[PDB]
Write an enzyme that holds these catalytic residues in place. Structure first.
Site, PDB file in Angstrom:
ATOM      1  N   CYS D  29       0.834  -1.193   0.000  1.00  0.00           N
ATOM      2  CA  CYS D  29       0.000   0.000   0.000  1.00  0.00           C
ATOM      3  C   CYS D  29       0.873   1.249   0.000  1.00  0.00           C
ATOM      4  O   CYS D  29       1.835   1.346   0.767  1.00  0.00           O
ATOM      5  CB  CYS D  29      -0.929   0.002   1.214  1.00  0.00           C
ATOM      6  N   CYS D  32       0.675   3.257   3.391  1.00  0.00           N
ATOM      7  CA  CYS D  32       1.469   2.668   4.463  1.00  0.00           C
ATOM      8  C   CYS D  32       2.949   2.986   4.293  1.00  0.00           C
ATOM      9  O   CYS D  32       3.632   3.341   5.261  1.00  0.00           O
ATOM     10  CB  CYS D  32       1.245   1.157   4.515  1.00  0.00           C
ATOM     11  N   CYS D 377     -16.765  11.180 -23.903  1.00  0.00           N
ATOM     12  CA  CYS D 377     -17.642  10.021 -24.010  1.00  0.00           C
ATOM     13  C   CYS D 377     -17.941   9.749 -25.479  1.00  0.00           C
ATOM     14  O   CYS D 377     -18.433  10.631 -26.191  1.00  0.00           O
ATOM     15  CB  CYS D 377     -18.935  10.248 -23.229  1.00  0.00           C
ATOM     16  N   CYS D 380     -21.780   9.974 -26.390  1.00  0.00           N
ATOM     17  CA  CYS D 380     -22.287  11.331 -26.565  1.00  0.00           C
ATOM     18  C   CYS D 380     -21.912  11.887 -27.934  1.00  0.00           C
ATOM     19  O   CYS D 380     -22.740  12.512 -28.607  1.00  0.00           O
ATOM     20  CB  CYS D 380     -21.758  12.237 -25.453  1.00  0.00           C
TER      21      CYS D 380
END
Ligand SMILES: OC[C@H]1O[C@@H](O[C@@H]2[C@H](O)[C@@H](O[C@@H]3[C@@H](O[C@H]4[C@@H](O)[C@H](O)[C@@H](CO)O[C@@H]4O)O[C@H](CO)[C@@H](O)[C@@H]3O)O[C@H](CO)[C@H]2O)[C@H](O)[C@@H](O)[C@@H]1O
Ligand SMILES: CC(=O)N[C@@H]1[C@@H](O)[C@H](O[C@@H]2O[C@H](CO)[C@@H](O)[C@H](O)[C@H]2NC(C)=O)[C@@H](CO)O[C@H]1O
Lengths: 99, 274, 364, 461, 365
Positions: D29, D32, D377, D380
């Protein structure tokens, strides 16, 4: 990458027909850097064939530029022969006034 | 206008012929300054510009040490990449790299670029954010993960947006007479009739600075492209550059043709007419 | 399709590779520890291999060790609002990347801790996300629109559902190379501005309740030029996951095989005719586009290798992006034998005909 | 490392201390790894007071699953071997050291004059409690309130005759001392409780209504106690460590205008924040991290309304006074932040925007069929020609109006909910507060049939 | 007089079938046929054993009189030619003792010495020269490249009694040395008791040429020189104004006099103190007995032919025999190979021309 070495038969300044000049062959965009380039003047090859150190060409490949002292002229059969991995047969490009 | 320091390095593996040939070149904007050759006898970073010769021995020593370290890293990268692609030890491979930064007119950092290709094909490139990596194939994924786990983007970004900017500003200040200066290009009209139906009209422009220039051909306002042969800017060896844009027009219709030139050497958009 | 997927177990680094096998068909000759039983619950990886052409070569496979981590790009930060790693992603992860001329996909499988099985010794793996592409090498037409197919299939996590999908489209020609496309359906956020006016059909195929689910992310490039050709990278972001997929986008279009000075000048028998300039305006790609000189109706049958000088001019980058070529051809001296024969010039290219668009000219 | 490595073998045996901080995370992580140095420094600086220990969920799934660990890093406070809530603080060594030191014990720091002066000299507020009787109900109530609000305020009590005699007269009182660095001539630096009875609820309400005062230093440790209601944040170079002069200058004008605006009866909170610490919140009001000296004012109501001051922050306070007077006098019309309206509508599909959505989409005498799309998009873009044709075919109808707005560069209204791209909404004439979400096809025929079977007037050709 | 231990030339027709025995350990072993290949120097002199089964393993041994190389020199030469362009196969021989069974010879059979060319792809192509010692087949630590062309090659291996070995290829010395140095059949060691002293750098000097600057101790917060206060501020009401401060540009970490990284004797290492386990006996190259000449390998592309097998104890005799065999067939073999290569190239060009004519005819219609 392994592309055909783009040759460029020209000169430093204007092609002074009958006067002192300097034929130069700029071959860039080739791989690997190995590319035997020579200058020709009326059938035979030119005496001087000193070329600058290669570098990263615009095509992300090798780049070499040759030069030599000689009288530039379209009448004199001045060309440039290249031979390497990409350029199998010795590509001989006629050198005119400029590029 | 906007300056930028670029440095590239090529490593050609030579099986059975010794170590791989390493060639490092460092130019600013469009004028080289440094250069390293593994086959040379000096074995040190040599200067390629007159403004860079003023550096003391410390700069040459550091540049030589860093050049050697990069040469060794590239040598190991040749074998690593050769083994990651399942290639034989007889073939000759090539590993190229190009890293540089850009700065505006006020000396502020613009952006950094760092790309690494192998065998002429793209291998691993650095993102524009200076924090992520971009791989080209499955072999580059391992290098991207290893670099991400080692925090290489932090050091690369810190060196591109920090030391690279200072070095670029110092180099531009020491050689402002050739890096920031701009000279007009020598134009000339060349006419060569190829036949009784059309002729060739090429516009030459030798001796100018910098080399980056844009020349386009127009026919009564309309763009002549892609019918105009335009060659890239080439260096004449004396630091300047030269360009030329040709175009075949009809027999006697070359008067309406116009040549537009725009670049650093020419502050105003030149428009030549035959 | 291919029964066993002989992949190369990598770290990666690519450093090196080891013997790896991916299931499932009857393949005993496996690496056991490397051979993992493919258990794709969505069916993307299974359908891709089942729909492969019979007799095709074995596609390249490369296995590596994947680690779940958030997307480095800030635009995808919306996909990971919580500042903590999900506990459902525990365990080891393996990234499988298969590329070939038929298609190129990349999935993320999860093998069991041990490979001990009752029947045969083989490790069991579960496919999580799969990023496949129908057209591995985009062959868009010069001046038309490029439809880069891109499919994906992900499984539902432990506790959504409607997981946010990440659409990332990039390329590189020389070259840059910037973020061409980048969207995130299901989460309204600030995405990067689209470049070159390209779009993408990134959206889930259906809104199921549990899972798994399959989405599409095909890119649309309006007016593909030569500068847009190159390598295109398509990545799909997911909660601590991501799938990359390369593509070789190449340009192509009909080649204007112009006949500069086609009709040879009325030269008497024994005189070399004019040097015909074989023109070729608008064509793609440059690879394979050659110019040949043949004398139809001579000593050969279909076409004989014509003599005379022959050269090729430099590549011209027209304003429409397509490159144009021009090869100078100097035929030999025509005579009575050349009379009647048609001196043609064959033009070879990917879009041109198989026999080559040749231009014949009746000699004098 | 400096932190104790806890595993599933010795978890419930070596975590039974009085106050132990557990940090369950994974080595892969990023949070971390970025928090490892701060955690090590805090653990090394908190030796003897509070112990710090880490837990790897990748190698201890039992301990992580028992505590319900779903993200890394997860910082939990363990008291006597049991869970005592999570650590709600920044992931830094200073924050963990200060929070752990203030929560080490007890809930109310007892002062035995040097201790009181050193405890009332912190960067945050201090709720000191004077009590001369050891068996007084006021002391018990203050202790309960401190134990119930110990995770947000710093409690402290003392029985000294000097402090108790100088801070109260009846021998029992509560004094709230604000930060000494934020002292100004617009409000007192201390607030005393005037309530007749001393209770935990009253103490919590008074503390929550007088700790910040006119405008406190909105930081990462007290941001949860200032945000929520109608607060007026002022982003700038807030940093008294290496820039207290400027912070006091800007805070003097902000508090100067807020004082005059509050003394007249207006109800509105205020607070100044740094543009760097709260840079992620500046995007919600349309402000960018200019990294300058001019402060940006942004008012946020308790419901969700956002009011950004367009005029530059003047040094005389006239701009702030005008903005506050306009916000209190109802100058802000329909709430709808978005980019400036274009020169005019392109055609067919009227370019709708939040700045003018209430004048076109909110038309009570015409049904507007909005269509929210994105600039990246593909659906669209592929639907743009069909939408344009549909809008042009209905140009003769004076009741229907096809519009389209960019949901990525304009805030959508509270009635509309943009889920994906694209999202079509059908707003009738007599139903602006109950718009219907279009779920049909994306073709011209589908839109024509839907408009002819839903709109009040039939779609024209 | 040179002692000829074994000699095989394949010049008696099928007589070689009486001297060579085929192993019966595997029921699907490769079959060897005596031929001279498509091209060779002599149709009768170039006749030898050649593999006719692709992707198989051959195991053909030849017995002879048993002998020991103790006190003398060993010479084993053989000619191998891969005219089929093998991409993964072996061409070495095995020297088995008298206790070897020709009817059950396999790859796992106990052998004495194993040398010869070995190929198996781009990364596999060395000259194997292992030797049995201490129950383990030690391999040569030197890299000896093997020929991969289609011509006939000559591989000779000599081992003198002085622990010396020499491997020649085509009558040319390609490698040589000692068995105790080229093989891991065993020198020195570092003293474990030695420890690197704490004073040994590995290091950073302070002030290489500087002095006490004193002024280096700059403040961490200095007032801004252009700090212009506001005219609308009343210092009499707030007590004062507020001069902001900022980090001084000359601020650094403490008073470090450029602690550069050196002033360095080098990386410390333990001093070598001889070795107790130092082993390299004088009888490492001496064998008990050698009376079997096996030949077992795995080739995927059959076509290799071996001949001119010699095993004597004189280097001069082996050199003369090698020069009078492969040396007299390499020239003619290369000549024939070139003559056939020319015809092959001509046929390929004709086929290409025919394909071009067919393409033109198909395009004309
Ligand atoms: O190599 C030293 C070793 O040689 C032994 O003799 C040989 C080997 O036992 C074996 O040779 C292999 C063989 O390999 C291929 C194939 O059999 C394998 O299955 C695949 C996958 O690994 O790889 C190869 O394709 O042939 C190769 C080419 O000839 C060879 O290079 C490789 O080592 O089989 C041959 C014939 O049976 C054996 O002679 C010796 O017994 C042993 O003492 C040596 O240490
Ligand atoms: C440069 C390099 O490493 N090339 C490798 C190929 O030579 C290799 O080919 C395979 O080689 C084996 C021996 O080296 C052959 O047995 C095998 O038949 C052959 N396979 C094919 C398909 O040619 C391949 C093997 O995958 O890896 C390359 O990396």
């Amino acid at each position: 990458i392994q592309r055909t070495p783009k040759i460029q038969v020209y000169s430093r300044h204007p092609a002074e027909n009958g006067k002192s000049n300097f034929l130069n062959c700029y071959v860039s965009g080739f791989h690997p850097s190995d590319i035997e380039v020579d200058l020709l003047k009326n059938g035979e090859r030119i005496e001087k064939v000193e070329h600058s150190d290669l570098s990263f060409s615009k095509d992300w490949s090798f780049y070499l530029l040759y030069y030599t002292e000689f009288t530039p002229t379209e009448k004199d059969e001045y060309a440039c022969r290249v031979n390497h991995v990409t350029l199998s047969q010795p590509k001989i490009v006629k050198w005119d006034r400029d590029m | 206008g906007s300056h930028s320091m670029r440095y590239f390095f090529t490593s050609v593996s030579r099986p059975g012929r010794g170590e791989p040939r390493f060639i490092a070149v460092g130019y600013v904007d469009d004028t080289q300054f440094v250069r390293f050759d593994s086959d040379a006898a000096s074995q040190r970073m040599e200067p390629r510009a007159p403004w860079i010769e003023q550096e003391g021995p410390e700069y040459w020593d550091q540049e030589t040490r860093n050049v050697k370290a990069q040469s060794q890293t590239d040598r190991v990268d040749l074998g690593t990449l050769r083994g990651y692609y399942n290639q034989s030890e007889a073939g000759s491979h090539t590993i190229q790299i190009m890293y540089g930064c850009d700065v505006g007119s006020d000396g502020r950092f613009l952006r950094g670029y760092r790309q690494d290709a192998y065998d002429g094909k793209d291998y691993i490139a650095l993102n524009e954010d200076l924090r992520s990596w971009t791989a080209a194939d499955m072999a580059a994924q391992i290098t991207k993960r290893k670099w991400e786990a080692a925090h290489e983007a932090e050091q690369l970004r810190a060196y591109l947006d920090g030391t690279c900017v200072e070095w670029l500003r110092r180099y531009l200040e020491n050689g402002k007479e050739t890096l920031q200066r701009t000279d007009p290009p020598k134009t000339h009209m060349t006419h060569h009739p190829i036949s009784d139906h059309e002729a060739t009209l090429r516009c030459w422009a030798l001796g100018f600075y910098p080399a980056e220039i844009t020349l386009t051909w127009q026919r009564d306002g309309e763009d002549q492209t892609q019918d105009t042969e335009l060659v890239e800017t080439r260096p004449a060896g004396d630091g300047t550059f030269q360009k030329w844009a040709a175009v075949v027009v009809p027999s006697g219709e070359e008067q309406r043709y116009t040549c537009h030139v725009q670049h650093e050497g020419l502050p105003k958009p030149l428009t030549l007419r035959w | 399709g291919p029964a066993v997927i002989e992949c190369w177990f990598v770290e990666d680094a690519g450093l090196a590779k080891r013997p790896g096998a991916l299931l499932p068909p009857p393949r005993p000759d496996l690496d056991p520890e490397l051979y993992l039983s493919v258990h794709d619950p969505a069916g993307a990886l299974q359908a891709a291999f089942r729909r492969y052409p019979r007799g095709a070569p074995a596609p390249h496979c490369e296995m590596s060790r994947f680690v779940p981590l958030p997307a480095s790009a800030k635009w995808a930060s919306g996909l990971t609002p919580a500042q903590n790693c999900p506990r459902a992603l525990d365990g080891a992860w393996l990234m499988v990347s298969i590329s070939s001329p038929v298609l190129s996909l990349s999935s993320l499988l999860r093998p069991q801790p041990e490979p001990q099985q009752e029947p045969v010794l083989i490790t069991m793996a579960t496919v999580v996300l799969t990023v496949l592409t129908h057209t591995p090498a985009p062959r868009v037409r010069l001046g038309q629109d490029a439809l880069l197919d891109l499919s994906f299939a992900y499984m539902p996590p432990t506790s959504p559902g409607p997981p946010p999908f990440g659409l990332e489209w990039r390329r590189q020609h020389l070259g840059k190379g910037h973020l061409l496309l980048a969207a995130t359906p299901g989460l309204n956020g600030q995405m990067p501005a689209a470049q070159e006016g390209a779009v993408a059909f990134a959206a889930w195929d259906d809104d199921e309740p549990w899972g798994p689910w399959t989405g599409n992310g095909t890119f649309w490039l309006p007016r593909v030029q030569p500068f847009q050709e190159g390598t295109y990278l398509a990545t799909i972001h997911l909660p601590y996951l991501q799938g990359q997929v390369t593509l070789e986008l190449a340009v192509y279009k009909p080649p204007k095989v112009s006949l500069m000075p086609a009709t040879l000048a009325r030269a008497a028998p024994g005189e070399a005719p004019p040097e015909l300039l074989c023109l070729v305006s608008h064509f793609y790609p440059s690879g394979g586009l050659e110019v040949e000189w043949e004398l139809r109706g001579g000593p050969g049958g279909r076409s004989q290798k014509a003599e005379g000088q022959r050269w090729l001019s430099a590549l011209r980058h027209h304003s429409d992006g397509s490159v144009s070529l021009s090869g100078h051809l100097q035929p030999p001296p025509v005579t009575t034998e050349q009379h009647g024969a048609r001196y043609a010039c064959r033009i070879h290219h990917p879009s041109l005909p198989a026999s080559g668009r040749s231009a014949e000219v009746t000699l004098e | 490392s400096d932190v104790l490595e806890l595993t599933d073998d010795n978890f419930e045996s070596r975590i039974s201390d009085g106050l132990m901080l557990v940090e369950f995370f994974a080595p892969w992580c990023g949070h971390c790894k970025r928090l490892a140095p701060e955690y090590e420094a805090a653990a090394t600086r908190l030796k003897g007071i509070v112990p710090l220990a880490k837990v790897d969920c990748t190698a201890n799934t039992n301990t992580c699953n028992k505590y319900g660990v779903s993200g890394y890093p997860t910082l939990k406070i363990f008291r006597d071997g049991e869970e005592a809530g999570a650590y709600d603080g920044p992931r830094t060594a200073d924050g963990i050291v200060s929070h752990l030191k203030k929560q080490a014990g007890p809930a109310s720091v007892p002062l035995r004059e040097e201790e009181f002066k050193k405890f009332i000299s912190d960067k945050d507020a201090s709720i000191v409690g004077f009590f001369d009787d050891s068996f007084s109900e006021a002391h018990s109530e203050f202790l309960k309130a401190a134990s119930n609000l110990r995770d947000n305020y710093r409690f402290a009590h003392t029985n000294v005759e000097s402090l108790v005699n100088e801070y109260d007269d009846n021998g029992e009182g509560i004094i709230l001392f604000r930060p000494s660095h934020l002292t100004n001539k617009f409000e007192d630096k201390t607030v005393a409780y005037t309530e007749q009875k001393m209770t935990s609820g009253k103490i919590k309400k008074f503390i929550q209504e007088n700790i910040f005062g006119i405008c406190p230093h909105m930081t990462e440790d007290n941001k949860d106690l200032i945000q929520g209601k109608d607060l007026l944040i002022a982003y700038y170079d807030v940093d008294y460590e290496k820039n207290a002069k400027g912070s006091n200058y800007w805070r003097n004008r902000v508090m100067m205008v807020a004082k005059k605006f509050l003394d007249a009866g207006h109800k509105l909170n205020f607070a100044v924040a740094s543009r760097k610490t709260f840079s992620h919140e500046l995007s919600d009001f349309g402000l960018e991290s200019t990294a300058g000296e001019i402060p940006v004012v942004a008012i946020r109501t308790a419901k969700g309304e956002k009011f950004v001051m367009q005029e530059e922050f003047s040094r005389d306070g006239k701009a702030l006074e005008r903005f506050l007077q306009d916000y209190f006098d109802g100058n802000l019309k329909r709430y709808l932040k978005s980019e400036p309206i274009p020169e005019s509508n392109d055609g067919p599909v009227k370019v709708v925007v939040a700045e003018n959505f209430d004048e076109i989409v909110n038309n009570e005498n015409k049904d507007v069929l909005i269509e929210f799309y994105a600039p990246w998009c593909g659906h669209c873009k592929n639907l743009e020609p069909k939408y344009k044709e549909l809008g042009e075919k209905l140009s003769k109808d004076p009741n229907i109006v096809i519009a389209k707005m960019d949901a990525t560069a304009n805030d959508v209204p509270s009635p509309y909910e943009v889920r994906g791209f694209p999202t079509i909404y059908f707003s009738p004439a007599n139903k602006k507060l109950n718009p219907k979400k279009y779920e049909g096809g994306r073709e011209l025929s589908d839109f024509i049939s839907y408009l002819q079977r839903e709109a009040t007037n039939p779609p024209v050709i | 007089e040179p002692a000829v231990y074994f000699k095989e030339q394949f010049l008696d027709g099928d007589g070689w079938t009486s001297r060579w025995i085929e192993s019966k350990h595997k029921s699907d072993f490769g079959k060897f046929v005596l031929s001279s290949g498509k091209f060779y120097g002599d149709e009768e002199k170039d006749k030898g054993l050649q593999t006719s089964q692709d992707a198989r393993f051959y195991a053909l041994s030849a017995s002879f009189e048993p002998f020991s190389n103790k006190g003398q020199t060993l010479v084993v030469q053989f000619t191998v030619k891969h005219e089929q362009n093998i991409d993964c196969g072996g061409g070495y021989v095995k020297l088995f003792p008298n206790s070897l069974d020709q009817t059950d010879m396999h790859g796992d059979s106990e052998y004495n010495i194993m040398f010869g060319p070995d190929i198996c792809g781009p990364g596999t192509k060395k000259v194997h020269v292992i030797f049995n010692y201490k129950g383990k087949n030690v391999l040569i630590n030197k890299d000896i490249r093997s020929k991969d062309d289609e011509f006939t090659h000559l591989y000779t291996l000599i081992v003198r009694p002085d622990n010396t070995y020499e491997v020649k290829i085509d009558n040319s010395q390609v490698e040589s040395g000692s068995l105790e140095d080229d093989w891991d059949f065993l020198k020195k060691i570092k003293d474990p008791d030695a420890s690197k002293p704490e004073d040994w750098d590995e290091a950073k000097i302070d002030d290489p040429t500087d002095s006490k600057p004193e002024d280096w101790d700059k403040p961490e917060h200095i007032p801004d020189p252009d700090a212009k206060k506001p005219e609308d501020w009343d210092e009499e009401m707030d007590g004062e104004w507020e001069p902001p401060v900022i980090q001084n540009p000359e601020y650094k970490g403490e008073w470090k006099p450029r602690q550069i990284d050196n002033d360095y004797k080098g990386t410390w290492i333990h001093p070598e103190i001889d070795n107790p386990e130092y082993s390299p006996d004088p009888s490492i190259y001496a064998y008990d007995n050698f009376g079997v000449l096996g030949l077992d390998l795995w080739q995927v592309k059959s076509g290799t032919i071996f001949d001119n097998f010699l095993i004597t104890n004189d280097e001069a005799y082996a050199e003369e025999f090698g020069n009078e065999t492969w040396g007299v067939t390499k020239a003619a073999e290369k000549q024939m190979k070139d003559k056939q290569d020319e015809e092959q190239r001509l046929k390929e060009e004709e086929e290409d021309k025919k394909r071009k004519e067919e393409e033109e005819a198909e395009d004309k219609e």
